[PDB]
Amino acid sequence: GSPEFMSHHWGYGKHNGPEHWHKDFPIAKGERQSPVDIDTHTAKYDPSLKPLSVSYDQATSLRILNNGHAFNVEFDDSQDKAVLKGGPLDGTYRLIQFHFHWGSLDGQGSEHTVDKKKYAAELHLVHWNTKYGDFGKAVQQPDGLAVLGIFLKVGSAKPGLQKVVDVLDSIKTKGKSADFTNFDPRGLLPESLDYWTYPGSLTTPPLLECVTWIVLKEPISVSSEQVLKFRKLNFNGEGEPEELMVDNWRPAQPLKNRQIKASFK
């Protein structure tokens, strides 16, 4: 073998989880870490914020990968096929992958919280600023990434999520991947694009402080059965002892010298 006996690589267990990450990644204690609690009454409506422009009609999904922490749905990011513009942004940001964070129980799983409330899961659509040419260069910049965060509440099923749920059997363990072409990420959005925004970081090591966070106010509803299937994934590789992929979330971090802005009043 089990990872706690073998290597101290970062993860979500008691011996390698978020409270340990600072040893290898000292920016974990930095000045613009994510996630944060969104205190709805102290967010500031900002009339200079523009509507968010989500252009996903030409998106090209490619593959779904269990990376040992989450699963990533990967996209072709070699052209402006699936881009995020507007909102708080001053550039064009290409979609590279999306993934989720989720809990062992319906009452936890989100990374951001809203008035201290946790959702069952949180979707992150990760985009990089095209002026930096590649994701790797973008994460050397304070405006390199834009992450669209969407909360998942348990209620009615989300039809546009079911293709993701259905394929998870085939990527149960770390390092497994499967074809995932022709997936439309528009099916994961809520009705409204009203949002909160603030400057933050990746929520996984290396925790780089590159992200303009755009967190949608409206959650999507997913069914209990959909999120239950997320919890049958494994952190471990094939042939290793089974450790269910659950509670792969970082808790809220100090807001420090930041003020969350709202696109709506």
Instruction: Return the bridge partners of 196, or none.
Output: 215, 262
The yes or no reply on residue 7 touching ligand 47J (CB under 6 A) is: no
Contact 141, 199 (CB under 8 A): no
Q: How far is CA 74 from the centre of its chain?
A: 13
Q: Return the range that interacts with ligand 47J (CB under 6 A); candidates 1-9, 40-48, 109-117, 165-173.
A: 1-9
- Binding of ligand 47J at residue 6 (CB under 6 A)? yes
Cα(85)–Cα(87) distance, integer angstroms:
7
In angstroms, what is the minimal distance from the CB of 2 to ligand 47J?
Answer: 5
Beta-carbon contacts of 40 under 8 Å, excluding residues fewer than 6 positions away, are 114, 115
Shortest separation between residue 133's beta carbon and ligand 47J, angstroms? 41
Nearest to 182 by CA among 56, 59, 82, 78: 59
124 binds, among Zn ion, Na ion, ligand 47J, none (CB under 5 to 8 A by kind): Zn ion
Q: Which residue has the tokens 């394929």?
A: 167
Nearer to Zn ion, 4 or 72 (CB): 72
Active site includes 69? yes
Peptide bond before residue 142 is cis, with ω within 30 degrees of 0: no
Site for ligand 47J contains 257 (CB under 6 A):
no
Please tell me whether residue 2 binds ligand 47J under the rule CB under 6 A: yes
Q: Could you check whether the bond before residue 35 is cis, i.e. omega within 30 degrees of 0?
A: yes
* Binding interface with Zn ion (CB under 5 A): 124
Query: Taking CB under 6 A as the rule, does residue 57 contact ligand 47J?
Result: no
Q: Which does 5 bind (CB under 5 to 8 A by kind): Zn ion, Na ion, ligand 47J, none?
A: ligand 47J
For Na ion, the binding residue among 88, 109, 144, 219 (CB under 5 A) is: 88
169 binds, among Na ion, ligand 47J, Zn ion, none (CB under 5 to 8 A by kind): Na ion
**Position of tokens 């095209």?**
130
What are the structure tokens assigned to 43, written together?
């967010």
**Does 204 show up as a binding residue in the annotation?**
yes
Q: Which distant-in-sequence residues (6+ apart) come within 8 Å of 22 by Cβ?
A: 28, 29
Annotated binding site: 99, 101, 124, 203-204
- Catalytically active residues are 69
Q: Which residues are annotated as a binding site for Zn(2+)?
A: 99, 101, 124
